[PDB]
Design a protein around this ligand. Structure first.
Ligand SMILES: CCCCCCCCCCCCCCCCCC(=O)OC[C@H](COP(=O)([O-])OCC[N+](C)(C)C)OC(=O)CCCCCCCCCCCCCCCCC
Ligand SMILES: CCCCCCCCCCCCCCCCCC(=O)OC[C@H](COP(=O)([O-])OCC[N+](C)(C)C)OC(=O)CCCCCCCCCCCCCCCCC
Ligand SMILES: CCCCCCCCCCCCCCCCCC(=O)OC[C@H](COP(=O)(O)OCCN)OC(=O)CCCCCCCCCCCCCCCCC
Ligand SMILES: CCCCCCCCCCCCCCCCCC(=O)OC[C@H](COP(=O)(O)OCCN)OC(=O)CCCCCCCCCCCCCCCCC
Ligand SMILES: CCCCCCCCCCCCCCCCCC(=O)OC[C@H](COP(=O)(O)OCCN)OC(=O)CCCCCCCCCCCCCCCCC
Ligand SMILES: CCCCCCCCCCCCCCCCCC(=O)OC[C@H](COP(=O)(O)OCCN)OC(=O)CCCCCCCCCCCCCCCCC
Ligand SMILES: CCCCCCCCCCCCCCCCCC(=O)OC[C@H](COP(=O)(O)OCCN)OC(=O)CCCCCCCCCCCCCCCCC
Ligand SMILES: CCCCCCCCCCCCCCCCCC(=O)OC[C@H](COP(=O)(O)OCCN)OC(=O)CCCCCCCCCCCCCCCCC
Ligand SMILES: CCCCCCCCCCCCCCCCCC(=O)OC[C@H](COP(=O)(O)OCCN)OC(=O)CCCCCCCCCCCCCCCCC
Ligand SMILES: CCCCCCCCCCCCCCCCCC(=O)OC[C@H](COP(=O)(O)OCCN)OC(=O)CCCCCCCCCCCCCCCCC
Lengths: 98, 115, 105, 347, 171, 175, 120, 80, 69, 140
C-alpha cells in the first residue's frame, strides 16, 4: 500500500501495546481506548476518501458516535470505583480473586 | 500553503512576547517571592489533592450530547436531497429523541448537583 | 445462524452501503466502479468455492485498482532508474519535463 | 431498578443481538455488538455492591478491547476488498484479528481470565443472562465467516479452552465459578467442530443453553450460591436434589441423557475428516468436567449433609418463586436422546 | 499484460479555444444553444465508448464548432461582448446577477444582428436525443466469457430412503 | 520536501501517540491526544475531508476537556509524572520514538518496507485522482445522505444514544 | 452445508416442496414419545410445587401434552423434509456426474483371492 | 385542561413555548400545500450532465433540441 | 471534457516516449506494459502522469485546490 | 515455529547427530521461552534479576531436555541401524525424562517423565511413519 496507511497502522499498534500493559491507573487505559478509536477513525476515513466511496461517508462519523457509547460509559464505571476506594488504582480491583 | 504561514506567523508573534518579557527587565529572585499565593498565609495541604467534583453526571451528558448534536450538523446539506419527506421525518425523530433524553434527565433529578 | 429477515420481508436496511456500485448520491461513481462491477457479475451465483479460482482475474484487477501496489512498484523502479542515470550524468531531462512545457489550453 | 427501565434494557439487549444476527453489513455488526455491551453493563450493576463494580469494569475493558480488534479487522477487510458484505474475508491478518476478537468476546482461553471473576461478582440472573444470551451473537459471526478462519488457530484455541476449563473446574467451591469453567470447556467443544460441520455446533449450542438454563434456574429455586447451601437443599425439597442430580449427570456427557447428544455426534464429524487423536483427547479432557459434576452430585443429592435448626421454619413456607419453564427445560435437558435426528431441522 | 495503446502527438494536435474562463462563461448559453449537436454527439460517444482514445474526432469537431461560434461572435458584436465578459471577469465569484445591463445589451445586439435567442430557465439542462450513425459497442467493458452457472434443482421431492439412515434409527 | 507533507504530519501523529500511550499522567496524556487529534485532522483535511477533520477535532477536544476535568477531580497524585519523573515511562517513550524514527529511516532509504503488510516509500500524492468533482464535494454529499438513505442507521444510533443516557442515569445511582 | 440451498428462499419453515411429501401419522411413535415428554413435564411441574402429582391440575397436564404434540409434529415434518432434500440432492449429484462415480465389477468368490490365516 | 395550561403557563412559560413551537413544527408541514414545490425545486436543480439518448427511431417524448416545446419546463418556478 | 481528454492523452504519450529512453539497458523490462489484465481504459492515476516532472507542478496539481486559501 | 519443526524433521535419522541436536535444542529453547514469558507475565517476580534468572532457568532446562532427547535418539538410531523405528524415540524420551528429573533434583519426577515422554515420543514417531494428522484439513 501507501505510506500514511503504514503510519496510521503503526499508531494503532503503539496505542494497542500502550493499552495492554496497564500502569496502575484507569484513566490512562481510557485514554488509550480513545486513541485506538481515533486511529481507527483516521484509517477508515483515509481509505474512504481515497477510494471515492461517497455513500460510506456516513460510516466514520456514526462510528465516532459509538466511541462515546463506551468511553463516557467507562467514566460511569469509574465514579463508583472512586466511591468504593479513595483512588482509581487497578490493584484495588482484586476482590474477585477467591 | 497560506494557513500554515498564518499559523507560524501568529505562533512566532506570540512566542516572541515572552522572551521579550523575560530577558529585558532587571530580575531579583529570592525564596519568598515565588511562593504560592494564599492571601498572605502559607496554604494547608497541596493543590494536587483530589478536588471532588459535583457535576459529573452533566459532564457525561455533555459527552454524549456534543456528538449527538454533531450528528445534526449536516442538516443544511440534507435539505438539498431529492427525497425530502424521509429527511424531514428522520431529522424530527433525531431531535425528538434528544428532547426525550433531556426530559428523562430532567425528571429523574439528573441535572441537580450532588451533595 | 443468519436469520435473513431483510429478503423475507423485502425491506432494505443496509444493502445500499454494502458495495461501491450501488445507488450513490447524484450518481457519483467510485474510482474502481468498473472493476468491482465486473468482479461481482463474474462471481454471481456460482459459489465462493468456484469463484475463488474461476473469477480470480477480475478480483486481482479490482485489488490492483484498490491499492495500486504494482503501479507504485513500476513508478518506484522508473524513478530509481532516472535518479541513477542523473547521478551518473548519462541522462538529461527533456524541456517539457522541466517546467517550460506549454500545455494544451 | 424501575421495572419499566429493566424491560427497556432487556429489550435493548435483545435488539442488539437481533441486529447482529440479521444484518448484512459489518458496521451494523459492530453497532449491534456495541449496543449489546452498553445495554448489558447495568444488568450486572443491579444490586450496587463493590463486586459488581469490579465485574463490570473487567467485563467492559475486555469487551472494549475485543470491539476495537473487531473494528480494526473490519477496516482491514474493507481496505483489501472494498465492500461490506458479511461473508468470507480476503486477508489472513483480518481473519486472525476477527478470530482473536470473537475469542475474547466468547471468553475462550487464553482469554478466559475474566469469565469466572465476572460470573462470580454478579447475581445469578445477570450471570445466566450473560453466559447464555451473550454467547449467541459471536457464534453467529463465526458461523458467517466459515471459509476464513485458520484451522490451526481455531483448533488450538478449542483444545486450549477445553483443557483449561477442565483443569480450572476442579478447584472451585463457588457454583458460579464452576458454571463459568464449564462454559469455557463447552466453548472449546463448540469451536472444535465449527470448521467441519456447523450444524453440530448449533446443536451443541442449543443443548448447552438448555442445560445451563436448567442449572441456573435450579440455583434460583434453591436460592443457593455455594456448595454448602446446595448440599443443605435436601432438607427443604428433595425433588430439587433429584432434578439437579439428573441435570449434572446430563452435563457430564453420560448416556442415555441429552448431554451425550452433541459430543458423540461431534466425534461423528471428526472421524469422517480423518482426525482421530483430537476427539479422543477431547473426551479424555471432558472426563474432568464429569469429575467435578460427580463431586457436586455427591455433595448435593447422594449424601445427606448435616443441616441447622432454623430450617425447621423453612418447612412451614412453600416456595413462591416464578420458576419459569423449569419442568419443560429439565425434560428437554434429560430425555432428548431418542429424538436424535431432530437436529436435521438445523441445516 | 498487453502494451497500452496511445495515440501519437500528431493525432492530438488541434487549434484550441484560447480564451479565458470568464469569456466562456459570458457566452455560455448562446454556445450551448447554437453548437448543441456536435457537443451532444461527442458526449454521447464519450458515455457510450468509455474511452477517450475512441472519441478524438468528435472532440476535434467540438473544438472546430466552438471556434466557429466565437469567430461568428467576433465578426459582428465584438465590443458589447467585450464589455460583458469584462464585467463578468471583474467579479470574484463570476456572478451572473451583477452584470444584468451589459448582458441585456449583449443579447439585444446579438438578436438584432444575428438572430440568436437566449434559452429560458432550465432549457439547457434538458436531456435530448441524438441521431448518430456509428454502431453501438456490443461489449464496452471488455469483459471475457462469464462462467457457467451451477445447475438448478428440479423434480418431485420423494421420501427419504429408509428414513434418516443415522446409526440404528429407522426413520 | 514539501511533497511529503502528509507523511510528516503522520510522523507527528505517531509521535503524539507514543507520547500519550506511555501513560505518564492523564494531563499530559490529554495534551498528547490533543496534538494527535490536531495532526490527524490535518491529515484527513489534506485528503479532502475537511468536514470530517473539523468534526473529529471538535469532538475530541470536548471529550479531552471533560476527561481533564475528571482527572483533576478524581485521578490525581501528589507528584504527577511529566515524562521523566518515572524511569519506565521515560524509557518506553524513548524506545517508542526510537522505533518510529528507525522505521522512518528504513522507509526513506530503499522506498520499501515489510511490516506485516508491504508498504512503499513514495509520498501519497501519487494515489490522488486527476479529475474534478463538479459543484459538490463528495464527502459532504455522502454525509448528507445519512437522512435520505440511512434511516435504519439513524434509528439505531438515536436509540443507542437514548439507551446510553438511561444507562448513565442507572449506573451512577448508589441504590 | 445446504446454506446456499436456503439462499433464494430463506426463513421458511416448510417450503412449497415440503407439501409433496407424506405427512407423519398422528400415531407416530416419535409423536407419542414427545407426548410422553409433555406428561413427564406436567408431573415435574406438579412435583416441584408440592402438589399431588397424579391428581392436581389435569387441565395443566392436558395443555402440556397438547403443546408438546403440536411442536413435535411440526418439527418432525421439517425433519422429514430436510432428509428428503438430502437424499434428492445426493441422487441428483450422482446422476449428474457419472464419471466421478464409475461402476465397479462384481467378481465372484471363485475368482477373487483371499489370504488364509490359520488359528492354531 | 384549561386550569393545567394556565398553571403551567404561570409556572414555566419556557416549556410551554417550546412545546407549542415543537407542535407547530411537527403538524404544520403536513398541512401546507407547498411541500411538493420544494420537491420539484430540489429535483429540478441540474447537478449532473443531461446525458443524451441514442435516437433509435421511436422516442416522441424527448426532444432533439433544448428549445423544442417537448420536455420538462420550469415556467411554474419562474412564476411561483 | 474534450480539452481534458486531449491533455491527459498528451501527458501519457509524453511519459511513455521518455520511459523508453530512460529504461533501455535494464534487463527484462517491457516499455508501456500495463498492470491490469484487461484492455479496458482506466482512469489515469496522479503518479502515472506527473511521475517525471518537477515538484512545483506536483504541488500545483495534487494539492492546489485544498491549499488554495 | 513451523520452520523449526520442518528443519528438524527433514534431516535423515541417524546421519548427522550434531545438526539434529542443535535443532532439538532450538525447539526446546523456544518452548522454554514461551513458558517463561507466560510465567513472568502472570506471576510477577519480585525483581528484574529474579525474572531473568527464572527465564534463563526455564530455557536452559527445556534446552537440555531437547538436546539430550535428540542426541539419544540419533545415537540409538545409528547404533541399531533402525532409522524408522519408534523405540529409538522411546529411548530419547526416557533420556529427556531423566534430564528433567536431574534438573528438578528428584527421582519420581524423572521416572514419570521418562515413561510419559517416551510414550509421547514413540507416538510422535508412529504418527510421522503412518502419516497421522492432528490438525486435519476438512475434506467431507
Ligand atoms: C509591547 C510593549 C513593550 C515593548 C518592549 C519594551 C519597550 C521598552 C524597552 C526598554 C526598557 C528599558 C530597559 C529595560 C528595563 C530596565 C529596567 C531597569 O530598571 O533596569 C535597571 C538595570 C540596571 O541595574 P543594575 O545593573 O545597576 O542592577 C541593580 C540591581 N543589583 C545591583 C541588585 C543587581 O538595567 C539593566 O540591567 C540594563 C537595562 C537596559 C540598558 C540599555 C540597553 C541598551 C538599550 C538601547
Ligand atoms: C482405562 C485405561 C486404559 C485405556 C486404554 C484405551 C485404549 C488405548 C489406545 C487408545 C487410542 C485412541 C483411540 C484410537 C482409535 C483409532 C481408530 C482408527 O481408525 O485408528 C486408525 C487411525 C489411522 O489414521 P487415519 O485413519 O486418520 O488415516 C487413514 C489411515 N492411514 C494411516 C493408513 C493413512 O489411527 C489414528 O488416527 C491414530 C491412532 C492413535 C491415537 C493416539 C492418541 C491417543 C493415545 C491414547 C490415549 C488414551 C487415553 C489416555 C487417558 C485415559 C484416562 C486417564
Ligand atoms: C408533541 C409535542 C412535541 C413534543 C416533542 C418535542 C419537545 C420539544 C421541547 C423539548 C423539551 C425538553 C425538556 C422537557 C422537560 C419536561 C419535564 C420536566 O422537567 O418537567 C418539570 C416541570 C415542572 O418543573 P419542576 O418539576 O419544578 O422542575 C425542576 C426544576 N425546574 O414540568 C412542567 O413544567 C410540565 C411539563 C409538561 C407539560 C407541558 C405542556 C405544554 C403545553 C404547550 C401548548 C400545547 C402543546 C400541544 C402539543 C403536545 C404537548 C404534550
Ligand atoms: C441456533 C440458534 C438457536 C437460538 C435459540 C434461541 C432461543 C430463545 C432464546 C434463549 C436464550 C435465553 C433466554 C432467556 C435468558 C435469561 C432470562 C433471565 O435470566 O430472566 C430472569 C428471570 C428472573 O425470574 P425471577 O426468579 O422472578 O427473578 C429473580 C430476581 N432477579 O427468569 C429466570 O431467571 C428464569 C429463566 C427464564 C427463562 C427460561 C427459558 C428460556 C431460556 C432457556 C431455553 C428454553 C428452551 C427454548 C429454546 C430452545 C433453544 C435454545
Ligand atoms: C504542543 C502544543 C501545540 C503547539 C503548536 C500549536 C500550533 C497551532 C495550534 C492551533 C491551530 C490548529 C489547527 C488545526 C487544523 C485546522 C485546519 C483548518 O483550519 O482548516 C481550515 C480550512 C478548511 O477549509 P476547506 O473546506 O478545506 O477549504 C478547501 C477549499 N478552499 O483548511 C484549508 O483551507 C486548507 C489549508 C491548508 C491546510 C494544510 C493541512 C493542515 C495543516 C495542519 C498544521 C498543524 C496543526 C497542528 C495542531 C496542533 C494542535 C495542538
Ligand atoms: C513488544 C511488546 C512490548 C512493546 C514495548 C517494549 C518496550 C517498553 C516496555 C518495557 C518493559 C517495561 C514495562 O512495560 O513495564 C510494565 C509497565 C507497568 O509497570 P509499572 O507499574 O510502571 O512498574 C512496575 C514494573 N515496571 O507498563 C508499561 O510500561 C506500559 C507502557 C508501554 C508503552 C508501549 C508503547 C511504546 C511503543 C512500543 C512499540 C510499538
Ligand atoms: C418451535 C419452532 C418454531 C419456528 C417458527 C419459524 C421460524 C423460522 O422462520 O425459522 C426459519 C429457520 C430456517 O431458516 P434458514 O434461513 O434456513 O436459517 C438458516 C440458519 N442458519 O428454521 C429453523 O431454524 C428451524 C429450527 C428452529 C429450532 C428452534 C428451537 C431449537
Ligand atoms: C499393567 C497395567 C495394565 C495393563 C496395560 C496394558 C498392558 C499390555 C499392553 C502393553 C504390553 C507391552 C507392549 C506390547 C508388546 C507386544 C507388541 C510390541 O509392541 O512388540 C514390540 C515391537 C516388536 O516389533 P514389531 O512387532 O515387529 O513392530 C512392527 C509391528 N507394528 O517393538 C517395536 O515395534 C519397537 C518399539 C515400538 C514402540 C513400543 C512402545 C510404544 C507402543 C506400546 C505402548
Ligand atoms: C532406581 C531408584 O533408586 O529408585 C528409587 C526412586 C526414589 O529415590 P530415593 O527414594 O531418593 O532413593 O524411586 C523412584 O524413582 C520411583 C519408582 C521408579 C520406577 C519404578 C517402576 C516399577 C514400579 C512397579 C511396577 C509394578 C507393575
Ligand atoms: C498422547 C499424544 C499423542 C500425539 C501423537 C502425535 C503424532 C504425530 C502427529 C504430527 C506429525 O508428526 O505428523 C507428521 C508430519 C510429517 O508428515 P507431513 O505432513 O508430510 O509433514 C510435512 C509438513 N507438511 O509432521 C509434521 O508435519 C511436522 C511435525 C509435527 C509434530 C507435532 C507434535 C510435536 C510435539 C508435541 C507438541
Amino acid at each position: 500500500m501507501s505510506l500514511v496507511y503504514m503510519n496510521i497502522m503503526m499508531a494503532f499498534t503503539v496505542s494497542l501495546t500502550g493499552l495492554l500493559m496497564y500502569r496502575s491507573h484507569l484513566m490512562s487505559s481510557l485514554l488509550c481506548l480513545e486513541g485506538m478509536m481515533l486511529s481507527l477513525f483516521i484509517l477508515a476515513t483515509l481509505m474512504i476518501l481515497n477510494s471515492h466511496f461517497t455513500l460510506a461517508s456516513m460510516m466514520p462519523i456514526i462510528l465516532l458516535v459509538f466511541a462515546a457509547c463506551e468511553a463516557a460509559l467507562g467514566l460511569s464505571l469509574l465514579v463508583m470505583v472512586s466511591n468504593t476506594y479513595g483512588t482509581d488504582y487497578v490493584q484495588n480491583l482484586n476482590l474477585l480473586q477467591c | 500553503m497560506n494557513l500554515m504561514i498564518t499559523l507560524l506567523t501568529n505562533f512566532t508573534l506570540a512566542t516572541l512576547l515572552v522572551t521579550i518579557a523575560f530577558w529585558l527587565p532587571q530580575l531579583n529572585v529570592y525564596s519568598e517571592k515565588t511562593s504560592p499565593y494564599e492571601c498572605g498565609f502559607d496554604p494547608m495541604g497541596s493543590a494536587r489533592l483530589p478536588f471532588s467534583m459535583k457535576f459529573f453526571l452533566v459532564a457525561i451528558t455533555f459527552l454524549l450530547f456534543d456528538l449527538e448534536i454533531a450528528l445534526l450538523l449536516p442538516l443544511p446539506w440534507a435539505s438539498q436531497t431529492t427525497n425530502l419527506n424521509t429527511m424531514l421525518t428522520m431529522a424530527l425523530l433525531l431531535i425528538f429523541l434528544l428532547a426525550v433524553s433531556l426530559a428523562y434527565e430532567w425528571t429523574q433529578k439528573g441535572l441537580e448537583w450532588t451533595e | 445462524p443468519f436469520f435473513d429477515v431483510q429478503k423475507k420481508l423485502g425491506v432494505d436496511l443496509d444493502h445500499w452501503m454494502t458495495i461501491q456500485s450501488a445507488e450513490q448520491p447524484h450518481r457519483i461513481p467510485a474510482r474502481c466502479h468498473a472493476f468491482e462491477k465486473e468482479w461481482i457479475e463474474c462471481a454471481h451465483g456460482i459459489g465462493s468455492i468456484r469463484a475463488e479460482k474461476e473469477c480470480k482475474i477480475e478480483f486481482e484487477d479490482f485489488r490492483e485498482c484498490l491499492l495500486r501496489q504494482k503501479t507504485m512498484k513500476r513508478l518506484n523502479a522508473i524513478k530509481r532508474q532516472r535518479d541513477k542515470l542523473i547521478k551518473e550524468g548519462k541522462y538529461t531531462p527533456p524541456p517539457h519535463h522541466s517546467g517550460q512545457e506549454d500545455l494544451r489550453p | 431498578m424501575n421495572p419499566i427501565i429493566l424491560i427497556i434494557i432487556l429489550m435493548t439487549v435483545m435488539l442488539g443481538t437481533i441486529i447482529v444476527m440479521i444484518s448484512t453489513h459489518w458496521l451494523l455488526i459492530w453497532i449491534g455488538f456495541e449496543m449489546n455491551m452498553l445495554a448489558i453493563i447495568p444488568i450486572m450493576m443491579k444490586k450496587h455492591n463493590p463486586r459488581a463494580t469490579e465485574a463490570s469494569t473487567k467485563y467492559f475493558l475486555t469487551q472494549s478491547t475485543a470491539s476495537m480488534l473487531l473494528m480494526m479487522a473490519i477496516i482491514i477487510n474493507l481496505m483489501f476488498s472494498g465492500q461490506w458484505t458479511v461473508m468470507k474475508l480476503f486477508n489472513p491478518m483480518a481473519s486472525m484479528l476477527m478470530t482473536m476478537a470473537l475469542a475474547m468476546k466468547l471468553g475462550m482461553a487464553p482469554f478466559h481470565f475474566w469469565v469466572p471473576e465476572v460470573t462470580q461478582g454478579i447475581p445469578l440472573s445477570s450471570g445466566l443472562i450473560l453466559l447464555t444470551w451473550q454467547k449467541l451473537a459471536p457464534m453467529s459471526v463465526l458461523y458467517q465467516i466459515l471459509p476464513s478462519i485458520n484451522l490451526d488457530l481455531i483448533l488450538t484455541l478449542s483444545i486450549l479452552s477445553i483443557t483449561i476449563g477442565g483443569w480450572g473446574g476442579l478447584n472451585q467451591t463457588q457454583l458460579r465459578k464452576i458454571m463459568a469453567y464449564s462454559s469455557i470447556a463447552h466453548m472449546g467443544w463448540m469451536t472444535a467442530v465449527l470448521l467441519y460441520n456447523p450444524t453440530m455446533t448449533l446443536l451443541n449450542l442449543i443443548i448447552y443453553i438448555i442445560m445451563t438454563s436448567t442449572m441456573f434456574t435450579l440455583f434460583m429455586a434453591n436460592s443457593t450460591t455455594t456448595t454448602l447451601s446446595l448440599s443443605h437443599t435436601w432438607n427443604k425439597a428433595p425433588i430439587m436434589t433429584i432434578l439437579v442430580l439428573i441435570t449434572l449427570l446430563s452435563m457430564g456427557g453420560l448416556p442415555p441423557l441429552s448431554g451425550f447428544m452433541p459430543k458423540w455426534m461431534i466425534i461423528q464429524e471428526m472421524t469422517k475428516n480423518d482426525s482421530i487423536i483430537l476427539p479422543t483427547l477431547m473426551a479424555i479432557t471432558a472426563l474432568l468436567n464429569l469429575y467435578f459434576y460427580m463431586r457436586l452430585t455427591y455433595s448435593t443429592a447422594l449424601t445427606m449433609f448435616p443441616s441447622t435448626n432454623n430450617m425447621k421454619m423453612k418447612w412451614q413456607f412453600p416456595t413462591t418463586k416464578r420458576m419459569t419453564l423449569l419442568p419443560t427445560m429439565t425434560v428437554l435437558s434429560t430425555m432428548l436422546l431418542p429424538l436424535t435426528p431432530i437436529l436435521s431441522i438445523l441445516e | 499484460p498487453g502494451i497500452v495503446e496511445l495515440p501519437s502527438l500528431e493525432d492530438l494536435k488541434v487549434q484550441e479555444v484560447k480564451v479565458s474562463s470568464s469569456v466562456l462563461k459570458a457566452a455560455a448559453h448562446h454556445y450551448g444553444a447554437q453548437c448543441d449537436k456536435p457537443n451532444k454527439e461527442f458526449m454521447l460517444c464519450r458515455w457510450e465508448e468509455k474511452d477517450p482514445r475512441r472519441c478524438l474526432e468528435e472532440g476535434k469537431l467540438v473544438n472546430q464548432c466552438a471556434l466557429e461560434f466565437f469567430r461568428q461572435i467576433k465578426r459582428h458584436c465584438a465590443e458589447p461582448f467585450t464589455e460583458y465578459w469584462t464585467c463578468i471577469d471583474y467579479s470574484g465569484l463570476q456572478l451572473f446577477r451583477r452584470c444584468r445591463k451589459e448582458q441585456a445589451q449583449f443579447d439585444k445586439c446579438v438578436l438584432d444582428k444575428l438572430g440568436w435567442v437566449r434559452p429560458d430557465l432550465g432549457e439547457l439542462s434538458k436531456v435530448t436525443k441524438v441521431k448518430t450513425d456509428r454502431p453501438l459497442p456490443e461489449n464496452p467493458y471488455h469483459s471475457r466469457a462469464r462462467p457457467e452457472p451451477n445447475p438448478e434443482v428440479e423434480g418431485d421431492l420423494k421420501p427419504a430412503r429408509h428414513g434418516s439412515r443415522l446409526f440404528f434409527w429407522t426413520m | 520536501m514539501m511533497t511529503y507533507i502528509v507523511f510528516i504530519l503522520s510522523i507527528i501523529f505517531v509521535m503524539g501517540f507514543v507520547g500519550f500511550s506511555s501513560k505518564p499522567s492523564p494531563i499530559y496524556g490529554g495534551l498528547g491526544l490533543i496534538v494527535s487529534g490536531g495532526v490527524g485532522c490535518g491529515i484527513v483535511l489534506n485528503f479532502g475531508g475537511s468536514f470530517l477533520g473539523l468534526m473529529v477535532f471538535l469532538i475530541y477536544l470536548g471529550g479531552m476537556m471533560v476527561v481533564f476535568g475528571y482527572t483533576t477531580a478524581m485521578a490525581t497524585e501528589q507528584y504527577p509524572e511529566v515524562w521523566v519523573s518515572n524511569k519506565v515511562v521515560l524509557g518506553t517513550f524513548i524506545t517508542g520514538l526510537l522505533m518510529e524514527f528507525l522505521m522512518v529511516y528504513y522507509v526513506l532509504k530503499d522506498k520499501e518496507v515489510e511490516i506485516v503488510f508491504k508498504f512503499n516509500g513514495m509520498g501519497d500524492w501519487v494515489i490522488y485522482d486527476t479529475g474534478d468533482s463538479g459543484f459538490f464535494s463528495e464527502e459532504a454529499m455522502g454525509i448528507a445522505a445519512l437522512y435520505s438513505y440511512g434511516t435504519w442507521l439513524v434509528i439505531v444510533t438515536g436509540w443507542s444514544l437514548l439507551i446510553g443516557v438511561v444507562v448513565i442515569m442507572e449506573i451512577t445511582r448508589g441504590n | 452445508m445446504m446454506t446456499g440451498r436456503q439462499a433464494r428462499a430463506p426463513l421458511q419453515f416448510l417450503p412449497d416442496e415440503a407439501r409433496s411429501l407424506p405427512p407423519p401419522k398422528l400415531t407416530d411413535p416419535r409423536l407419542a414419545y414427545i407426548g410422553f415428554l409433555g406428561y413427564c413435564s406436567g408431573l415435574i411441574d406438579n412435583a416441584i410445587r408440592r402438589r399431588p402429582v397424579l391428581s392436581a391440575g389435569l387441565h395443566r397436564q392436558f395443555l402440556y401434552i397438547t403443546s408438546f404434540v403440536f411442536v413435535g409434529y411440526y418439527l418432525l415434518k421439517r425433519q422429514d423434509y430436510m432428509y428428503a432434500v438430502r437424499d434428492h440432492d445426493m441422487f441428483s449429484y450422482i446422476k449428474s456426474h457419472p464419471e466421478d462415480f464409475p461402476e465397479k465389477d462384481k467378481k465372484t468368490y471363485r475368482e477373487v483371492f483371499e489370504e488364509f490365516h490359520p488359528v492354531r | 385542561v384549561a386550569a393545567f395550561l394556565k398553571n403551567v403557563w404561570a409556572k414555566e412559560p419556557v416549556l410551554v413555548a417550546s412545546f407549542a413551537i415543537a407542535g407547530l413544527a411537527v403538524i404544520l408541514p403536513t398541512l401546507s400545500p407547498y411541500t411538493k414545490y420544494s420537491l420539484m425545486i430540489n429535483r429540478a436543480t441540474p447537478y449532473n450532465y443531461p446525458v443524451p439518448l441514442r435516437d433509435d427511431g421511436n422516442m416522441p417524448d424527448v426532444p432533439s433540441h433544448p428549445q423544442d416545446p417537448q420536455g420538462p419546463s420550469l415556467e411554474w418556478l419562474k412564476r411561483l | 471534457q474534450a480539452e481534458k481528454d486531449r491533455r491527459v492523452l498528451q501527458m501519457l504519450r509524453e511519459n511513455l516516449e521518455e520511459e523508453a529512453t530512460i529504461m533501455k539497458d535494464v534487463p527484462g523490462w517491457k516499455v508501456g506494459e500495463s498492470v491490469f489484465h484487461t484492455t479496458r481504459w482506466v482512469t489515469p492515476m496522479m503518479g502515472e502522469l506527473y511521475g517525471l516532472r518537477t515538484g512545483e507542478e506536483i504541488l500545483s496539481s495534487t494539492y492546489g485546490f485544498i491549499w488554495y486559501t | 515455529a513451523k520452520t523449526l519443526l520442518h528443519q528438524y524433521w527433514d534431516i535423515p535419522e541417524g546421519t548427522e547427530c550434531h545438526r539434529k541436536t542443535y535443532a532439538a535444542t532450538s525447539i526446546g529453547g523456544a518452548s522454554g521461552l514461551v513458558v517463561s514469558a507466560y510465567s513472568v507475565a502472570l506471576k510477577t517476580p519480585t525483581s528484574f534479576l529474579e525474572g531473568v534468572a527464572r527465564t534463563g532457568r526455564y530455557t536452559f532446562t527445556a534446552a537440555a531436555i531437547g538436546a539430550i532427547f535428540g542426541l539419544t535418539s540419533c545415537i540409538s538410531a545409528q547404533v541399531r541401524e533402525k532409522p524408522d523405528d519408534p523405540l529409538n524415540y522411546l529411548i530419547g524420551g526416557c533420556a529427556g525424562g531423566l534430564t528433567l528429573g536431574a534438573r528438578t533434583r528428584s527421582y519420581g519426577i524423572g521416572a514419570a517423565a521418562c515413561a510419559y515422554m517416551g510414550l509421547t515420543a514413540a507416538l510422535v514417531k508412529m504418527g510421522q511413519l503412518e502419516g497421522w494428522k492432528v490438525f486435519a484439513e476438512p475434506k467431507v
